[PDB]
Amino acid sequence: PPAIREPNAEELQRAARIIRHSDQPDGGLALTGDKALLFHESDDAFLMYARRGRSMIALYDPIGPAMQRAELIWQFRDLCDLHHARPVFYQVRAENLPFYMDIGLTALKLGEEARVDLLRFDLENAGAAMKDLRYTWNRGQRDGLALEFHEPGQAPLDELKAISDAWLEKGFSLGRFTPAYLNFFRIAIVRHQGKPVAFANLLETDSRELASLDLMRVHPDAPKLTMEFLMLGLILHYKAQGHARFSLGMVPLAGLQPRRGAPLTQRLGALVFRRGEQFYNFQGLRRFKDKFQPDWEPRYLAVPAGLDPLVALADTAALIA
Ligand SMILES: [Ca+2]
Ligand SMILES: [Cl-]
Ligand SMILES: [Cl-]
Ligand code: NA
């Protein structure tokens, strides 16, 4: 069986086209080039994945139309069997579980994704959360914070490096601070009285269903408000652009409201994020995202049914680390 390999420049351009035509901006993670790409037999869909131990671990649901996603999942099962490897899907949506169920996988809760409904979102709405946001926006501007947007390839790289350096690659589920990769994206920069203090690359598609985040890095010496200001600014930006939803990203299990007495399928997923003698607890991450009144949806780890998931969990942990 032919060797699993990283994509070439041409394959990446094909992925990019597919992402643009999709409603799944998070497919942009493919563009780092550190994940193998499995293309649907029409180049209208793709699945991205990496190998760790005897697991082949896909990142997210496949990118593309519904039928092609379902077909790529069966393809991937075949491909894993061909390589004597177990299939694993990292961070997938509930609506696709029946497809994973059909290729013989069960699922473990991994965490929850926060998405803002941009249509219903409004700073003048009732409640304390909006009041606090209105304060952040005004105070922020009063204090010399300003958000700017750059078309792909136009952000001043060397000013980004400064920020990125102070704030510090894990890969797979994360973007890479490289020109090659960042050149694919619109980039937002927060300046404090002219000085760059945070940035974020923006994951979009040609449609306005969904925009989301990849790298978001703030200077350690930036004003405390900087990260909230940036996020609020992005939400306001995409609301104004006519986008429907904006994704704030996932909070893993241990960062959610605790649930002892919960069955193991809703607990074992924490094993993906261990830090020495301790689980990553992601303190405050959930609280921060909740500032924007998102909606929350579970994300799952799909793993072989009937078999002890510890080994798939170990492989996923190594991959994510
Ligand atoms: Ca299996
Ligand atoms: Cl007010
Ligand atoms: Cl546009
Ligand atoms: Na088809």
GROMACS .gro file of C-alpha atoms and ligand atoms in nm:
model
  325
    1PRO     CA    1   0.000   0.000   0.000
    2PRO     CA    2   0.134   0.344  -0.108
    3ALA     CA    3   0.283   0.553   0.172
    4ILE     CA    4   0.089   0.817   0.362
    5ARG     CA    5   0.244   1.156   0.282
    6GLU     CA    6   0.207   1.531   0.322
    7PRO     CA    7   0.028   1.722   0.043
    8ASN     CA    8   0.213   1.918  -0.228
    9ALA     CA    9   0.150   2.281  -0.325
   10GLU     CA   10  -0.101   2.168  -0.587
   11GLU     CA   11  -0.296   1.950  -0.346
   12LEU     CA   12  -0.311   2.241  -0.102
   13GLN     CA   13  -0.457   2.466  -0.372
   14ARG     CA   14  -0.724   2.200  -0.435
   15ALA     CA   15  -0.806   2.193  -0.063
   16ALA     CA   16  -0.825   2.572  -0.060
   17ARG     CA   17  -1.082   2.568  -0.344
   18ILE     CA   18  -1.288   2.309  -0.162
   19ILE     CA   19  -1.278   2.511   0.160
   20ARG     CA   20  -1.387   2.827  -0.021
   21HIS     CA   21  -1.688   2.649  -0.168
   22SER     CA   22  -1.788   2.503   0.167
   23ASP     CA   23  -1.962   2.616   0.482
   24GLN     CA   24  -1.674   2.481   0.692
   25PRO     CA   25  -1.404   2.750   0.747
   26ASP     CA   26  -1.224   2.524   0.996
   27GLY     CA   27  -1.111   2.319   0.697
   28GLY     CA   28  -0.849   2.592   0.663
   29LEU     CA   29  -0.643   2.391   0.916
   30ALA     CA   30  -0.558   2.167   0.619
   31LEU     CA   31  -0.353   2.447   0.472
   32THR     CA   32  -0.059   2.403   0.715
   33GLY     CA   33   0.044   2.106   0.505
   34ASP     CA   34   0.114   1.884   0.807
   35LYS     CA   35  -0.191   1.663   0.752
   36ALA     CA   36  -0.240   1.403   0.481
   37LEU     CA   37  -0.532   1.472   0.249
   38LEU     CA   38  -0.780   1.222   0.120
   39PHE     CA   39  -0.976   1.359  -0.174
   40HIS     CA   40  -1.320   1.253  -0.281
   41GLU     CA   41  -1.313   1.112  -0.636
   42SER     CA   42  -1.418   1.446  -0.788
   43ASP     CA   43  -1.206   1.695  -0.593
   44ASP     CA   44  -1.516   1.853  -0.441
   45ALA     CA   45  -1.447   1.724  -0.090
   46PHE     CA   46  -1.159   1.616   0.128
   47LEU     CA   47  -1.073   1.454   0.459
   48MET     CA   48  -0.756   1.548   0.650
   49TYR     CA   49  -0.575   1.320   0.887
   50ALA     CA   50  -0.251   1.218   1.054
   51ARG     CA   51  -0.103   0.893   1.176
   52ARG     CA   52   0.001   0.825   1.533
   53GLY     CA   53   0.085   0.475   1.650
   54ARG     CA   54  -0.160   0.239   1.480
   55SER     CA   55  -0.427   0.508   1.462
   56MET     CA   56  -0.514   0.722   1.166
   57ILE     CA   57  -0.673   1.023   1.315
   58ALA     CA   58  -0.888   1.253   1.108
   59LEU     CA   59  -0.919   1.619   1.202
   60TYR     CA   60  -1.289   1.727   1.215
   61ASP     CA   61  -1.565   1.602   0.989
   62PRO     CA   62  -1.470   1.588   0.617
   63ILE     CA   63  -1.489   1.917   0.424
   64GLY     CA   64  -1.748   1.930   0.144
   65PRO     CA   65  -2.114   1.850   0.060
   66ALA     CA   66  -2.313   1.612   0.281
   67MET     CA   67  -2.311   1.309   0.051
   68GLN     CA   68  -1.940   1.347  -0.020
   69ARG     CA   69  -1.869   1.375   0.352
   70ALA     CA   70  -2.056   1.051   0.412
   71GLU     CA   71  -1.869   0.883   0.125
   72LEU     CA   72  -1.530   1.007   0.246
   73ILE     CA   73  -1.598   0.854   0.586
   74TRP     CA   74  -1.648   0.510   0.425
   75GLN     CA   75  -1.338   0.572   0.209
   76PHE     CA   76  -1.137   0.648   0.520
   77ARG     CA   77  -1.255   0.326   0.682
   78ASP     CA   78  -1.131   0.133   0.379
   79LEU     CA   79  -0.805   0.324   0.381
   80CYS     CA   80  -0.744   0.246   0.748
   81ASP     CA   81  -0.817  -0.123   0.688
   82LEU     CA   82  -0.574  -0.114   0.399
   83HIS     CA   83  -0.306   0.022   0.635
   84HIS     CA   84  -0.391  -0.207   0.930
   85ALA     CA   85  -0.481   0.098   1.136
   86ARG     CA   86  -0.778   0.200   1.348
   87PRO     CA   87  -0.990   0.495   1.238
   88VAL     CA   88  -1.034   0.786   1.477
   89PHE     CA   89  -1.209   1.117   1.415
   90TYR     CA   90  -1.108   1.412   1.630
   91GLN     CA   91  -1.371   1.674   1.721
   92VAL     CA   92  -1.675   1.587   1.512
   93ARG     CA   93  -2.036   1.711   1.520
   94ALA     CA   94  -2.329   1.513   1.653
   95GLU     CA   95  -2.510   1.522   1.317
   96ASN     CA   96  -2.241   1.298   1.165
   97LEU     CA   97  -2.235   1.036   1.440
   98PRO     CA   98  -2.474   0.815   1.244
   99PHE     CA   99  -2.212   0.800   0.969
  100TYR     CA  100  -1.939   0.710   1.219
  101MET     CA  101  -2.184   0.456   1.370
  102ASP     CA  102  -2.209   0.293   1.026
  103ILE     CA  103  -1.835   0.244   0.979
  104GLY     CA  104  -1.818   0.082   1.322
  105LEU     CA  105  -1.717   0.370   1.552
  106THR     CA  106  -1.870   0.487   1.874
  107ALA     CA  107  -1.803   0.827   2.025
  108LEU     CA  108  -1.670   1.000   2.336
  109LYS     CA  109  -1.757   1.355   2.438
  110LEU     CA  110  -1.450   1.570   2.381
  111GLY     CA  111  -1.577   1.916   2.475
  112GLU     CA  112  -1.815   2.188   2.356
  113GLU     CA  113  -1.790   2.447   2.079
  114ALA     CA  114  -1.914   2.802   2.130
  115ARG     CA  115  -2.074   2.985   1.838
  116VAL     CA  116  -2.224   3.329   1.835
  117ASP     CA  117  -2.551   3.379   1.647
  118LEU     CA  118  -2.459   3.701   1.470
  119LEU     CA  119  -2.813   3.763   1.347
  120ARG     CA  120  -2.957   3.765   1.701
  121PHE     CA  121  -2.650   3.928   1.856
  122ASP     CA  122  -2.692   4.294   1.940
  123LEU     CA  123  -2.507   4.521   2.184
  124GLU     CA  124  -2.829   4.705   2.273
  125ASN     CA  125  -3.008   4.384   2.383
  126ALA     CA  126  -3.117   4.329   2.744
  127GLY     CA  127  -2.891   4.191   3.016
  128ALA     CA  128  -2.560   4.237   3.195
  129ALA     CA  129  -2.346   4.057   2.937
  130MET     CA  130  -2.423   4.314   2.668
  131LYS     CA  131  -2.380   4.597   2.918
  132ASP     CA  132  -2.029   4.469   2.998
  133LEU     CA  133  -1.952   4.440   2.625
  134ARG     CA  134  -2.071   4.795   2.551
  135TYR     CA  135  -1.836   4.905   2.827
  136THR     CA  136  -1.547   4.707   2.680
  137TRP     CA  137  -1.598   4.856   2.335
  138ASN     CA  138  -1.612   5.215   2.459
  139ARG     CA  139  -1.345   5.186   2.729
  140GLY     CA  140  -1.122   5.004   2.481
  141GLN     CA  141  -1.151   5.276   2.220
  142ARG     CA  142  -1.106   5.538   2.492
  143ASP     CA  143  -0.780   5.364   2.584
  144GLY     CA  144  -0.642   5.365   2.231
  145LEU     CA  145  -0.733   5.012   2.122
  146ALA     CA  146  -0.825   4.982   1.753
  147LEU     CA  147  -0.897   4.677   1.535
  148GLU     CA  148  -0.784   4.656   1.174
  149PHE     CA  149  -0.830   4.405   0.895
  150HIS     CA  150  -0.591   4.296   0.623
  151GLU     CA  151  -0.661   4.117   0.297
  152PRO     CA  152  -0.456   3.794   0.261
  153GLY     CA  153  -0.082   3.852   0.233
  154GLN     CA  154  -0.101   4.218   0.337
  155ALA     CA  155  -0.052   4.210   0.712
  156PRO     CA  156   0.298   4.329   0.805
  157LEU     CA  157   0.458   3.996   0.898
  158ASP     CA  158   0.750   4.124   1.104
  159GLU     CA  159   0.508   4.307   1.336
  160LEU     CA  160   0.317   3.984   1.383
  161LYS     CA  161   0.636   3.796   1.474
  162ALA     CA  162   0.706   4.041   1.755
  163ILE     CA  163   0.365   3.963   1.904
  164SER     CA  164   0.389   3.590   1.834
  165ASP     CA  165   0.738   3.571   1.984
  166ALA     CA  166   0.641   3.741   2.312
  167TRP     CA  167   0.336   3.513   2.334
  168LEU     CA  168   0.571   3.215   2.322
  169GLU     CA  169   0.442   2.471   1.707
  170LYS     CA  170   0.198   2.199   1.822
  171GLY     CA  171   0.031   2.152   1.482
  172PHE     CA  172  -0.237   1.903   1.377
  173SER     CA  173  -0.534   2.080   1.541
  174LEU     CA  174  -0.349   2.414   1.544
  175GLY     CA  175  -0.227   2.656   1.278
  176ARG     CA  176   0.138   2.743   1.224
  177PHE     CA  177   0.301   3.081   1.244
  178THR     CA  178   0.453   3.068   0.898
  179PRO     CA  179   0.419   3.306   0.601
  180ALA     CA  180   0.319   3.014   0.379
  181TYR     CA  181   0.019   2.938   0.598
  182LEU     CA  182  -0.083   3.284   0.713
  183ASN     CA  183  -0.079   3.411   0.353
  184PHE     CA  184  -0.402   3.214   0.293
  185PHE     CA  185  -0.598   3.427   0.543
  186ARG     CA  186  -0.741   3.763   0.628
  187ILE     CA  187  -0.567   3.885   0.940
  188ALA     CA  188  -0.702   4.110   1.213
  189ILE     CA  189  -0.465   4.321   1.422
  190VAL     CA  190  -0.531   4.513   1.739
  191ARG     CA  191  -0.317   4.820   1.789
  192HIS     CA  192  -0.273   5.011   2.112
  193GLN     CA  193  -0.201   5.372   2.016
  194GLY     CA  194  -0.041   5.248   1.695
  195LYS     CA  195   0.159   4.964   1.849
  196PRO     CA  196   0.057   4.609   1.749
  197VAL     CA  197  -0.051   4.407   2.055
  198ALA     CA  198  -0.263   4.118   1.920
  199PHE     CA  199  -0.349   3.938   1.600
  200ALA     CA  200  -0.567   3.659   1.465
  201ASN     CA  201  -0.592   3.485   1.130
  202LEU     CA  202  -0.950   3.454   1.013
  203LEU     CA  203  -1.103   3.133   0.878
  204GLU     CA  204  -1.372   3.210   0.619
  205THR     CA  205  -1.537   3.059   0.313
  206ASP     CA  206  -1.703   3.225   0.012
  207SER     CA  207  -2.039   3.189   0.187
  208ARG     CA  208  -2.138   3.381   0.499
  209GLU     CA  209  -2.268   3.086   0.702
  210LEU     CA  210  -1.971   3.066   0.934
  211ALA     CA  211  -1.642   3.236   1.017
  212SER     CA  212  -1.400   3.119   1.287
  213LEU     CA  213  -1.064   3.137   1.458
  214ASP     CA  214  -0.727   2.969   1.439
  215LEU     CA  215  -0.424   3.156   1.582
  216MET     CA  216  -0.504   3.426   1.833
  217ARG     CA  217  -0.202   3.573   2.009
  218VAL     CA  218  -0.183   3.870   2.245
  219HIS     CA  219   0.131   4.052   2.367
  220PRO     CA  220   0.185   3.979   2.740
  221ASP     CA  221   0.220   4.350   2.809
  222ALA     CA  222  -0.094   4.441   2.617
  223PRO     CA  223  -0.381   4.609   2.812
  224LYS     CA  224  -0.593   4.351   2.998
  225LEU     CA  225  -0.892   4.435   2.777
  226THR     CA  226  -0.711   4.346   2.454
  227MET     CA  227  -0.834   3.992   2.400
  228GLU     CA  228  -1.197   4.071   2.481
  229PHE     CA  229  -1.182   4.381   2.260
  230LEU     CA  230  -1.043   4.175   1.972
  231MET     CA  231  -1.313   3.908   2.002
  232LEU     CA  232  -1.595   4.162   2.034
  233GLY     CA  233  -1.454   4.346   1.733
  234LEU     CA  234  -1.450   4.030   1.522
  235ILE     CA  235  -1.811   3.954   1.617
  236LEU     CA  236  -1.918   4.309   1.526
  237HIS     CA  237  -1.716   4.286   1.203
  238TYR     CA  238  -1.877   3.960   1.086
  239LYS     CA  239  -2.225   4.070   1.196
  240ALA     CA  240  -2.179   4.377   0.978
  241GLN     CA  241  -2.050   4.165   0.687
  242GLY     CA  242  -2.375   3.967   0.694
  243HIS     CA  243  -2.233   3.646   0.837
  244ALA     CA  244  -2.476   3.423   1.027
  245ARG     CA  245  -2.252   3.257   1.283
  246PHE     CA  246  -1.910   3.313   1.434
  247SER     CA  247  -1.721   3.032   1.605
  248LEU     CA  248  -1.522   3.105   1.923
  249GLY     CA  249  -1.374   2.754   1.928
  250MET     CA  250  -1.390   2.452   2.155
  251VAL     CA  251  -1.363   2.411   2.530
  252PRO     CA  252  -1.250   2.059   2.625
  253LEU     CA  253  -1.434   1.853   2.889
  254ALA     CA  254  -1.233   1.959   3.190
  255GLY     CA  255  -1.313   2.325   3.118
  256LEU     CA  256  -1.689   2.259   3.126
  257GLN     CA  257  -1.916   2.247   3.430
  258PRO     CA  258  -1.802   1.936   3.622
  259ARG     CA  259  -2.007   1.614   3.604
  260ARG     CA  260  -1.916   1.330   3.838
  261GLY     CA  261  -2.161   1.042   3.826
  262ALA     CA  262  -2.150   1.085   3.449
  263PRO     CA  263  -2.099   0.771   3.241
  264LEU     CA  264  -1.747   0.705   3.116
  265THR     CA  265  -1.826   0.798   2.751
  266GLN     CA  266  -1.882   1.148   2.875
  267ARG     CA  267  -1.563   1.150   3.087
  268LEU     CA  268  -1.278   0.951   2.928
  269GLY     CA  269  -1.230   1.227   2.667
  270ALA     CA  270  -1.051   1.437   2.931
  271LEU     CA  271  -0.758   1.197   2.885
  272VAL     CA  272  -0.678   1.375   2.559
  273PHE     CA  273  -0.555   1.678   2.757
  274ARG     CA  274  -0.318   1.585   3.036
  275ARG     CA  275  -0.041   1.804   3.168
  276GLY     CA  276   0.194   1.598   3.384
  277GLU     CA  277   0.034   1.505   3.714
  278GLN     CA  278  -0.278   1.703   3.624
  279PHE     CA  279  -0.548   1.741   3.357
  280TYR     CA  280  -0.548   2.067   3.164
  281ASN     CA  281  -0.834   2.247   3.332
  282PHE     CA  282  -0.867   2.536   3.088
  283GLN     CA  283  -0.953   2.769   3.372
  284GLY     CA  284  -1.161   3.067   3.269
  285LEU     CA  285  -1.174   2.964   2.905
  286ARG     CA  286  -1.545   2.881   2.922
  287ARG     CA  287  -1.618   3.193   3.129
  288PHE     CA  288  -1.439   3.410   2.875
  289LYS     CA  289  -1.629   3.273   2.576
  290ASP     CA  290  -1.957   3.309   2.766
  291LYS     CA  291  -1.901   3.685   2.772
  292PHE     CA  292  -2.040   3.688   2.422
  293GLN     CA  293  -2.350   3.474   2.486
  294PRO     CA  294  -2.258   3.199   2.242
  295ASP     CA  295  -2.452   2.879   2.190
  296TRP     CA  296  -2.278   2.558   2.290
  297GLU     CA  297  -2.269   2.226   2.104
  298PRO     CA  298  -2.085   1.907   2.195
  299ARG     CA  299  -1.791   1.781   1.989
  300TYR     CA  300  -1.690   1.419   1.991
  301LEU     CA  301  -1.401   1.182   1.949
  302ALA     CA  302  -1.511   0.893   1.727
  303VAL     CA  303  -1.328   0.568   1.809
  304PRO     CA  304  -1.365   0.193   1.729
  305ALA     CA  305  -1.676   0.044   1.891
  306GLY     CA  306  -1.648  -0.250   2.127
  307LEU     CA  307  -1.278  -0.195   2.196
  308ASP     CA  308  -1.105  -0.030   2.491
  309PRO     CA  309  -1.067   0.332   2.385
  310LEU     CA  310  -0.758   0.394   2.601
  311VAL     CA  311  -0.516   0.327   2.316
  312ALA     CA  312  -0.702   0.557   2.072
  313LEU     CA  313  -0.705   0.815   2.350
  314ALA     CA  314  -0.324   0.782   2.399
  315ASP     CA  315  -0.267   0.829   2.025
  316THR     CA  316  -0.496   1.128   2.015
  317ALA     CA  317  -0.324   1.278   2.321
  318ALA     CA  318   0.018   1.246   2.155
  319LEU     CA  319  -0.115   1.395   1.835
  320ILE     CA  320  -0.276   1.694   2.008
  321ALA     CA  321   0.026   1.764   2.232
  322CA      CA  322  -1.168  -0.089   1.384
  323CL      CL  323  -2.479   5.149   2.903
  324CL      CL  324  -1.585   3.989   0.111
  325NA      NA  325  -2.127   1.155  -0.498
   0.00000   0.00000   0.00000
